[PDB]
Amino acid sequence: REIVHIQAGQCGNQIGAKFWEVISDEHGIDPTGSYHGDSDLQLERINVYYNEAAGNKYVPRAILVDLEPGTMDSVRSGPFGQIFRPDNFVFGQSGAGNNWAKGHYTEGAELVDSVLDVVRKESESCDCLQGFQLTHSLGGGTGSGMGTLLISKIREEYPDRIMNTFSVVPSPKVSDTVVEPYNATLSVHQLVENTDETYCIDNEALYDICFRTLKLTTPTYGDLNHLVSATMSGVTTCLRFPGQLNADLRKLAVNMVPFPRLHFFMPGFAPLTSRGSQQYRALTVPELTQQMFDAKNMMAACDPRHGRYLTVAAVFRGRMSMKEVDEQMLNVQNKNSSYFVEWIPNNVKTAVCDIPPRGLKMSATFIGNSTAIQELFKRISEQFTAMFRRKAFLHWYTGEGMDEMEFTEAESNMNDLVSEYQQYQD
Amino acid sequence: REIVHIQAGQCGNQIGAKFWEVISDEHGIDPTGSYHGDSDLQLERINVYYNEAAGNKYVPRAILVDLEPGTMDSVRSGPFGQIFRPDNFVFGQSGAGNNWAKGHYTEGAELVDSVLDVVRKESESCDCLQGFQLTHSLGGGTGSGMGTLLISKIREEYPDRIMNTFSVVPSPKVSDTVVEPYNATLSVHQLVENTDETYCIDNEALYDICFRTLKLTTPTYGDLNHLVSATMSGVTTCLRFPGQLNADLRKLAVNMVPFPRLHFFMPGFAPLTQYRALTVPELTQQMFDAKNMMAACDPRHGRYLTVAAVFRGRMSMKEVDEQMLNVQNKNSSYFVEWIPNNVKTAVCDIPPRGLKMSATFIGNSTAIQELFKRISEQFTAMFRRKAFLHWYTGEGMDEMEFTEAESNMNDLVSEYQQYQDA
Amino acid sequence: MEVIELNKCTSGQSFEVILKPPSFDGVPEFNASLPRRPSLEEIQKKLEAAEERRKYQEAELLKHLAEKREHEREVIQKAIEENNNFIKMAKEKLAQKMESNKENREAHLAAMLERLQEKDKHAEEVRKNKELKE
Amino acid sequence: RECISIHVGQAGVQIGNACWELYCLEHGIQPDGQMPSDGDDSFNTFFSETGAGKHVPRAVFVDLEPTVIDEVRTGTYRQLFHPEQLITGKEDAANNYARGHYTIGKEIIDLVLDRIRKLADQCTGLQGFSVFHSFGGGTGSGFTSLLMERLSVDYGKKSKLEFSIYPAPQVSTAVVEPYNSILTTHTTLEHSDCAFMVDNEAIYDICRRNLDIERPTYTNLNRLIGQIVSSITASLRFDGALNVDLTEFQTNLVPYPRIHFPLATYAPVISAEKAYHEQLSVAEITNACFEPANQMVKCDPRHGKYMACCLLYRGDVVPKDVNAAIATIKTKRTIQFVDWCPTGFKVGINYEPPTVVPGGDLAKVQRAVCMLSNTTAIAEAWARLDHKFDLMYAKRAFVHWYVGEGMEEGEFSEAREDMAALEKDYEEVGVDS
Amino acid sequence: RECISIHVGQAGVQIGNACWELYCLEHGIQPDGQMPSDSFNTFFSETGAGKHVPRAVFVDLEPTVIDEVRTGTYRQLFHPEQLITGKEDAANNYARGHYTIGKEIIDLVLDRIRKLADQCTGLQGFSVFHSFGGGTGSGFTSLLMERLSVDYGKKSKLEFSIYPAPQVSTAVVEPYNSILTTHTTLEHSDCAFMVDNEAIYDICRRNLDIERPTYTNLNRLIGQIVSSITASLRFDGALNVDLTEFQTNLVPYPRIHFPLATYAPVISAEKAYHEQLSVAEITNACFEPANQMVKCDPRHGKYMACCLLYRGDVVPKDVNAAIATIKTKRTIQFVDWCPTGFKVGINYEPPTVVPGGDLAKVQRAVCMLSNTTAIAEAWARLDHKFDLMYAKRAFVHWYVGEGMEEGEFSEAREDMAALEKDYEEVGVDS
Ligand SMILES: Nc1nc2c(ncn2[C@@H]2O[C@H](COP(=O)(O)OP(=O)(O)OP(=O)(O)O)[C@@H](O)[C@H]2O)c(=O)[nH]1
Ligand SMILES: Nc1nc2c(ncn2[C@@H]2O[C@H](COP(=O)(O)OP(=O)(O)OP(=O)(O)O)[C@@H](O)[C@H]2O)c(=O)[nH]1
Ligand SMILES: COc1cc([C@@H]2c3cc4c(cc3[C@H](O)[C@H]3COC(=O)C23)OCO4)cc(OC)c1OC
Ligand SMILES: COc1cc([C@@H]2c3cc4c(cc3[C@H](O)[C@H]3COC(=O)[C@H]23)OCO4)cc(OC)c1OC
Ligand SMILES: Nc1nc2c(ncn2[C@@H]2O[C@H](COP(=O)(O)OP(=O)(O)O)[C@@H](O)[C@H]2O)c(=O)[nH]1
Numbered sequence A: 001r002e003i004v005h006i007q008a009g010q011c012g013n014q015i016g017a018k019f020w021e022v023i024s025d026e027h028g029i030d031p032t033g034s035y036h037g038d039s040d041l042q043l044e045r046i047n048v049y050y051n052e053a054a055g056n057k058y059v060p061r062a063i064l065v066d067l068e069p070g071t072m073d074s075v076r077s078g079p080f081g082q083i084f085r086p087d088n089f090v091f092g093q094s095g096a097g098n099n100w101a102k103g104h105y106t107e108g109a110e111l112v113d114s115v116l117d118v119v120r121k122e123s124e125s126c127d128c129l130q131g132f133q134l135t136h137s138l139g140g141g142t143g144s145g146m147g148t149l150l151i152s153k154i155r156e157e158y159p160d161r162i163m164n165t166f167s168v169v170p171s172p173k174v175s176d177t178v179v180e181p182y183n184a185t186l187s188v189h190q191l192v193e194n195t196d197e198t199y200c201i202d203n204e205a206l207y208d209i210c211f212r213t214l215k216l217t218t219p220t221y222g223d224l225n226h227l228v229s230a231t232m233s234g235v236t237t238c239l240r241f242p243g244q245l246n247a248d249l250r251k252l253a254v255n256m257v258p259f260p261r262l263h264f265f266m267p268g269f270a271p272l273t274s275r276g277s278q279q280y281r282a283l284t285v286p287e288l289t290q291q292m293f294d295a296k297n298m299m300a301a302c303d304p305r306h307g308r309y310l311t312v313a314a315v316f317r318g319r320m321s322m323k324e325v326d327e328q329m330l331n332v333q334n335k336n337s338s339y340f341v342e343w344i345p346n347n348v349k350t351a352v353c354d355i356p357p358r359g360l361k362m363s364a365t366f367i368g369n370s371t372a373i374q375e376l377f378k379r380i381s382e383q384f385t386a387m388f389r390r391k392a393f394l395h396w397y398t399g400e401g402m403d404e405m406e407f408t409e410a411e412s413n414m415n416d417l418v419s420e421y422q423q424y425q426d
Numbered sequence B: 001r002e003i004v005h006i007q008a009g010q011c012g013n014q015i016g017a018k019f020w021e022v023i024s025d026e027h028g029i030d031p032t033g034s035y036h037g038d039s040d041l042q043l044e045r046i047n048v049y050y051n052e053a054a055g056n057k058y059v060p061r062a063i064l065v066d067l068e069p070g071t072m073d074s075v076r077s078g079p080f081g082q083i084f085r086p087d088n089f090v091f092g093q094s095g096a097g098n099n100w101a102k103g104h105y106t107e108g109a110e111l112v113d114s115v116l117d118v119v120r121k122e123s124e125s126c127d128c129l130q131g132f133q134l135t136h137s138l139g140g141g142t143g144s145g146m147g148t149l150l151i152s153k154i155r156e157e158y159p160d161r162i163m164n165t166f167s168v169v170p171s172p173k174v175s176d177t178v179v180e181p182y183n184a185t186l187s188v189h190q191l192v193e194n195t196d197e198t199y200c201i202d203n204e205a206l207y208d209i210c211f212r213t214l215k216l217t218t219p220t221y222g223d224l225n226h227l228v229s230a231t232m233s234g235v236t237t238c239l240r241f242p243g244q245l246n247a248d249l250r251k252l253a254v255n256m257v258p259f260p261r262l263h264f265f266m267p268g269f270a271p272l273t274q275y276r277a278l279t280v281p282e283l284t285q286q287m288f289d290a291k292n293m294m295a296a297c298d299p300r301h302g303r304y305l306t307v308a309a310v311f312r313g314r315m316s317m318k319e320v321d322e323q324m325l326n327v328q329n330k331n332s333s334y335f336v337e338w339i340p341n342n343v344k345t346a347v348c349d350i351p352p353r354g355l356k357m358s359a360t361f362i363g364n365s366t367a368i369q370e371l372f373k374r375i376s377e378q379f380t381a382m383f384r385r386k387a388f389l390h391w392y393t394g395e396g397m398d399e400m401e402f403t404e405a406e407s408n409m410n411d412l413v414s415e416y417q418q419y420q421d422a
Numbered sequence C: 001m002e003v004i005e006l007n008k009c010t011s012g013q014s015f016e017v018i019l020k021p022p023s024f025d026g027v028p029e030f031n032a033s034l035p036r037r038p039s040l041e042e043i044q045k046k047l048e049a050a051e052e053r054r055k056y057q058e059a060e061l062l063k064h065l066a067e068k069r070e071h072e073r074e075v076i077q078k079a080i081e082e083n084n085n086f087i088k089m090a091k092e093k094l095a096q097k098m099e100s101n102k103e104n105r106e107a108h109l110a111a112m113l114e115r116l117q118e119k120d121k122h123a124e125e126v127r128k129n130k131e132l133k134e
Numbered sequence D: 001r002e003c004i005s006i007h008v009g010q011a012g013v014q015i016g017n018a019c020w021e022l023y024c025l026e027h028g029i030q031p032d033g034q035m036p037s038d039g040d041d042s043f044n045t046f047f048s049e050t051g052a053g054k055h056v057p058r059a060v061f062v063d064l065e066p067t068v069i070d071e072v073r074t075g076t077y078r079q080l081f082h083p084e085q086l087i088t089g090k091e092d093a094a095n096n097y098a099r100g101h102y103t104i105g106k107e108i109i110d111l112v113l114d115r116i117r118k119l120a121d122q123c124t125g126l127q128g129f130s131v132f133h134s135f136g137g138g139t140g141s142g143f144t145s146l147l148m149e150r151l152s153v154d155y156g157k158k159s160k161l162e163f164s165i166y167p168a169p170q171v172s173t174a175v176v177e178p179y180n181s182i183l184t185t186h187t188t189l190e191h192s193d194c195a196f197m198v199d200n201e202a203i204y205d206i207c208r209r210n211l212d213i214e215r216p217t218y219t220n221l222n223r224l225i226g227q228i229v230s231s232i233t234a235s236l237r238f239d240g241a242l243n244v245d246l247t248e249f250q251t252n253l254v255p256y257p258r259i260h261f262p263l264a265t266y267a268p269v270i271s272a273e274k275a276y277h278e279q280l281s282v283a284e285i286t287n288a289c290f291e292p293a294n295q296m297v298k299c300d301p302r303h304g305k306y307m308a309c310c311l312l313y314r315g316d317v318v319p320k321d322v323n324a325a326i327a328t329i330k331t332k333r334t335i336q337f338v339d340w341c342p343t344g345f346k347v348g349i350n351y352e353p354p355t356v357v358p359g360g361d362l363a364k365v366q367r368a369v370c371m372l373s374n375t376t377a378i379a380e381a382w383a384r385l386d387h388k389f390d391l392m393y394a395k396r397a398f399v400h401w402y403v404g405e406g407m408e409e410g411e412f413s414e415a416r417e418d419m420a421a422l423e424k425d426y427e428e429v430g431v432d433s
Numbered sequence E: 001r002e003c004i005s006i007h008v009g010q011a012g013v014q015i016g017n018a019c020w021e022l023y024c025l026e027h028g029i030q031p032d033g034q035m036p037s038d039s040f041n042t043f044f045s046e047t048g049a050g051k052h053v054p055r056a057v058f059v060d061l062e063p064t065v066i067d068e069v070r071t072g073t074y075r076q077l078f079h080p081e082q083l084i085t086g087k088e089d090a091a092n093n094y095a096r097g098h099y100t101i102g103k104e105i106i107d108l109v110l111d112r113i114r115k116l117a118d119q120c121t122g123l124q125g126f127s128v129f130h131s132f133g134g135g136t137g138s139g140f141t142s143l144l145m146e147r148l149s150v151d152y153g154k155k156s157k158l159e160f161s162i163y164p165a166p167q168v169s170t171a172v173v174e175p176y177n178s179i180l181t182t183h184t185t186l187e188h189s190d191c192a193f194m195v196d197n198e199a200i201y202d203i204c205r206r207n208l209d210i211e212r213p214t215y216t217n218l219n220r221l222i223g224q225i226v227s228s229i230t231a232s233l234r235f236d237g238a239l240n241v242d243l244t245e246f247q248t249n250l251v252p253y254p255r256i257h258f259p260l261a262t263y264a265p266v267i268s269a270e271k272a273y274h275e276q277l278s279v280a281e282i283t284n285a286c287f288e289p290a291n292q293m294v295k296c297d298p299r300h301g302k303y304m305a306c307c308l309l310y311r312g313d314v315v316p317k318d319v320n321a322a323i324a325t326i327k328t329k330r331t332i333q334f335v336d337w338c339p340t341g342f343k344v345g346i347n348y349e350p351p352t353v354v355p356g357g358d359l360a361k362v363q364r365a366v367c368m369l370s371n372t373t374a375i376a377e378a379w380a381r382l383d384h385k386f387d388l389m390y391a392k393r394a395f396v397h398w399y400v401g402e403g404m405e406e407g408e409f410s411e412a413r414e415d416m417a418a419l420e421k422d423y424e425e426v427g428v429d430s
């Protein structure tokens, strides 16, 4: 098939931008220009991620959405700014948000159509559609509330085609607001119901990796982001690249999720961090795997251990041998055989690809549907359950025009999800 | 009288071709041509086997039948190819068969009439008809199933006239298919009920003679057939040849069979496969041998009902009549006393193949049962847990139809076995 | 000894040496029978009732055979009947399983589409609840 | 007066063919034409003098295939009959009485029965028919009986004489032979006035001791029967007492209704090569007359009694000898004359010397004899036959081939059961009180 | 007479592509043109006045695979018409093929194939190659097969199925997919050739000695088997061959029985000069648990029909002496009621292997097709997988989602239950 991409909400935006510019120079694209890497591969599938307009140029099938100017003009002036087509930007003008309510109801619906329509003109343009990947922030409004609407309006116009997100679930540590739970728990309700798959990048791991295991004292929003970026490269790999599989996202659903309740994957990466070393290269492949299936190395605040694995997909990248890899992978599912659902016979498949990411001559990455993920939900609920208790900051949405019962009804959707994951440790 | 001949089913065909060309050059016929043997005899009775068309030429009264081209065009291109009349070939196109069912029901009736009719135009052509001799394979479809139908349609249009066959009953050694029993036992039922006489050439003796007593290590279908061919020459001899008797096939029924149940003759040949010195004692001895019969069977384990034997060459009924007798004494035991003269013997002055001295043997012996009991034994054990059967169930047959043919056979056995009495 | 001369002719002569006479007063009666079969042209009609048996056997075993004959015609027929008769079944239970498919997904669809439609007569009927607090 | 030969049946035919041959040789008949040689008839006994050259027999040949009959229409003698006296049935030999007497016979019986009247239509007062046929064997086992049935219906008085050929294990044809004789001879016996059995195993056997051939050819046998047959008849083709006219044939030979089959014995059979040793004692020819080995039906009348006796001589022979030779026959004899039948010895010298066929086997005989005796012992042969039959029928042997052509099994039990009567009839005459 | 190859399904396609390759090499076909150097007509139709072209159909529901056929040589060897590409949505569930996405293309395919048997004076049947598990060849295959039977009642059909092997396999859902297809499918196939990768792969270890097995690698090996399998009816068809006798000769019972396959001397180049393999050994090694085709062993199960297809310089006098000696050093195991099958098919024609290749010049090779109870063992290992997933609706709702009744599942697996008993049931009688 072939996919298009929605990138909404200040975070979701930087995430996608720092994404776009990492993958773009994997395939050898200049700020506008075309190819500049006399290595051949790259382009077979450049397909899936780039509609290509006049002359050379390559232009990503990407749509930019926000409810305040600023954060787009940070991509426009900056990185690979000159890449995205101009009528593909959808600036909101408007009040920011930073309350779901704003972006899902008031200033939300305000835009919807303007965006909903440019999305149509790009997906109707594309040859046979796959689905959409949207990148957004699960806490705080524009893209927690907008994006969750967006989907609940995509799905509906596109019920055949499938639904993907990278959601950044917020922390108490380098988060901004003490409304976050409200926003996450409101989106997270929406999420569960209309994505066929979602990746959770929890900022908590994202911080924890940055300082607790990467020397870095004051974690930038950048020296932090480059993480998620690099993860996202290595998660999409297969649908971007060679001959082996190619992965219809569909294929990556009905292979990753046993259960309708879209079960969100924690990702995990291989070797990591900023610039100032650990390009040792000597990341032997035992050494790669070991570091990949690690608690202190997952993309969500979660240590598999306290949760068995449902199904798992891991892809390697570089110049090595499935000779060692297929061998190595197996000594994991034994020296770990216990936590790994036996009732799903082959729950772990493994791919190789000859073209490295970033620096790295050897680099893998990991997609993981594990009951372990519940840990993370139970936590947002924990802050929420304790806040909405004596109805704390709430009167802040009551006002943008929501119902009291709507929180509980989203709360005990969550509080179910938990109690289903926990149920599948059977 | 005068006879016509049906040669149906890839085996039945080679058998009849290798026949036709052996007998034809006994009478001195060229691929088309006429006579080329300044010896006189030959032609009196050339009659009985050859209707003769324009100019010289001689053409056999023969009809060729198959449900797939191939095997005729193996005669057409080949031996005495140019002999047979073209609108006498009846190619099937069609699926092969290799299930009786195919050749007796589906692709079978498909052709019937086309053949049945050419047979009519040849028998209505002939002066006073004798009957028909059909050569066919009792195991595997086209001619186990076709031929069996054919007769069960001949008989019916020709109830006066009489019914002959050379049936090749198949083995487990140099047979082809694990269905054989089924086909045989199906035909064998049919056989019993509408032939007035049948000869059994069991491939098992045919093999056993070829290797067990004839040096030959990998038995061809050819270096194998020439056996049956030769036998068939020497079995028809009398109705083809001189003055002595001449044998109305009729005459050869009501002399060979005491019992309606058509009792099939095992044949036996003389020398096989050129010392000449085949003294005649030496001939008889080798002829009335276990290791020399045309059906897997060793008379011993069966008495003889009635037996007919013809000698061929320049020798003397002076020694032969004398020799035959010293058999029916050094063997007197096994030889029904309740049929006074059960053994007659003929001489004829013109040798077959190579051979200056050569005889052959026609044998109605309760011994033959041995062979039927065997097909039954493979069958009885197969149709048991209804093995490959669902293969005919499909072409549209009945379960009970097998049992009803099985316990026809298994009767036949138990009648032959019954006539070891006095 | 005496002879007894019986005729004399152009080309022969006969007699009798009767040698000793018999031991006689006449005697026997050995199938010299008092009812003994003078026979009769009427028994051509004995030649017939034998040939009405042949005409029989022929006509009732050409009957025990057009009998066989016309079962055949019905086996090859119950096979055009076997086949024809299973096309018409697994040919039709094919498309029957295919209305059960376009129909069932017609549901799990426009009933998935159903949820995401009063999620919407709620966005807009509690934005006309924007007119509430303010 | 006159006399029609009927030869139904392949054997009959050839036999006919080969005694008609001898008829000619004897009367002076070049195949085609006249006796043209340098009272009013005498040879007319058998023949009618047609055209104004031709001599032609009073003959009929019937067989149900051509084959045999044709050969008559091929080789000289082919001129000697009318094509009309030569009925060929082109259809289906047979090999069972059932065939002839019923199935295939029905067909031709009319055309035959016809011609033969057509033949006795010339004839100022016919006498009867001598009818020659094979005992066993399809159409002359079978058809012979059918012929004979009708014959008796059409010629009530006029008497009938069968020359039967009783079949011999070695020089025979088919398994079913017994069934066939026994079958015919049952039906046949009530319609024939006297009947000449001829057993091959006796002729063949003679052609061994006498003609010294390891060989016996069909033809061989025939000329020999041919000869006897000459001597048998010919009393009535030459006219000279000792029986001429058929009625003298029962009168002098059968004392009882039951067809009795006289025993035959030709005199000096002797090969050429040896033909110049001759002069055979008018006594020896007689002595060798009473010779088990020199018989005609394999048996012996040392075992049985005699109930009528009959010498037919032929050659330079004045009775004064015969008589002296009878005398000496009786005292060196187990003579055995039964009880109640003074002593038959009708003697028929016949002057006319007995020409034999010129290629031949036998030669110039200046005196020969014939001896027709009815003796109980002729039964022995009936027994040998029955027993064969008996033992086949005991298992329906081939039965169903006749039942098939359309007979009742009951013809069988009821036929063999007639031999049962005859075999008792025979032994019954034996040595009385 | 004639014979249409149908390759549905990505596996089937590549397999096809790589035994059609072997076909050519064997018959003398330069990709484009003629053998310029009937009988071979068994499969092909001699079109134009130059080019030889197969009786072939390829179907898959994405391009990708099929395109590679229209790229590299052999790209000249088909019509673009025999090459159906469905551009749309691969799948990975039977529910996909057999119902959702299949519905779309079934017509256009069902078409072309008749169009193809429209040339053909009396077709014989189709051999259909497809993957056991895996979207469109699990799914569509079954759909194809339904329809086929409706349109060619008599004409018999032969599946070549690839039974999927935990290590060199694709998706979790594979069990569901085979068990699904093989239920529907089994009513409509007249005999079916299972091929299990874990046996091929496993052969390419002991025999080809590659730590590697490449997809292509496996293919050329199956390709070979398939050559020997067929080719009774391509080469020796100088006249009278006709299925119904590969048939008649192998399955004793309605239930589609999947014969067991076993190629003879597989042996690498580098090692190609050691040759002269005992006409006895190729036979002895034929009866070799390790040298099989479907991972299992007939030491455990009984035999109910047996069949040797030789290929090379071979007079029977040997084969026979080599059977004899196979009899006495054997747990031979011939079941009860089927006197000893041993249809022997020597084929004179030596077995050309691919020139780059892996295997080399073989002067004599064998094949051995046997229907044995033991072939069940593999049906068990499959079922059990399924059994244990379904025990928790595992992925069910993805099929239910595209529009199936759950009851197709219980009612499918419950057919295997039947077959699995059927199988064991034949075993050692009274
Ligand atoms: N003595 C003698 N017997 C013969 C002759 N020809 C045949 N026979 C015998 O007659 C018996 C059978 O009679 P056939 O004349 O052969 O048969 P048929 O029924 O009269 O005529 P067909 O229909 O030709 O069979 C056999 O026992 C033969 O031995 C012959 O020329 N001389
Ligand atoms: N032996 C063999 N197996 C293959 C090959 N290609 C795929 N497979 C197997 O086939 C099974 C799945 O079938 P696929 O052909 O891959 O999928 P499909 O439904 O037919 O086609 P897609 O729509 O492309 O998914 C897996 O177990 C694979 O191991 C091949 O070339 N050789
Ligand atoms: C695009 O993303 C990917 C998707 C897949 C999934 C996947 C996922 C599985 C799985 C199998 C498979 C299957 O082999 C693939 C075929 O197509 C895919 O998308 C697959 O077993 C357990 O989980 C496999 C991937 O490689 C590990 C992958 O790499 C990023
Ligand atoms: C055409 O085939 C033949 C047929 C006959 C049979 C045959 C068969 C007999 C038998 C006799 C006779 C009889 O003399 C024959 C007259 O016509 C025949 O067909 C006969 O006693 C026991 O079995 C006899 C034959 O010669 C032995 C013969 O030769 C092949
Ligand atoms: N890791 C990642 N998370 C971010 C980033 N910016 C904000 N967030 C997180 O997302 C939450 C708010 O998302 P944001 O994009 O600022 O809100 P919005 O743009 O108005 O939708 C905060 O709790 C942050 O922890 C970003 O730079 N990267």
Ligand SMILES: Nc1nc2c(ncn2[C@@H]2O[C@H](COP(=O)(O)OP(=O)(O)O)[C@@H](O)[C@H]2O)c(=O)[nH]1
Residues within 6 Å of the ligand: B009, B010, B011, B012, B014, B015, B096, B097, B098, B137, B138, B139, B140, B141, B142, B143, B144, B168, B170, B171, B174, B175, B176, B177, B180, B203, B206, B221, B222, B224, B225, B228
């Ligand atoms: N001896 C003889 N038997 C043959 C020949 N060909 C086949 N058979 C036997 O007959 C059986 C099959 O007959 P076949 O002619 O092949 O079948 P059909 O032609 O379709 O009727 C096999 O078991 C063979 O053993 C032949 O050449 N000669």
Ligand SMILES: [Mg+2]
Residues within 6 Å of the ligand: E090, E091, E092, E093, E134, E135, E136, E137
């Ligand atoms: Mg697929």
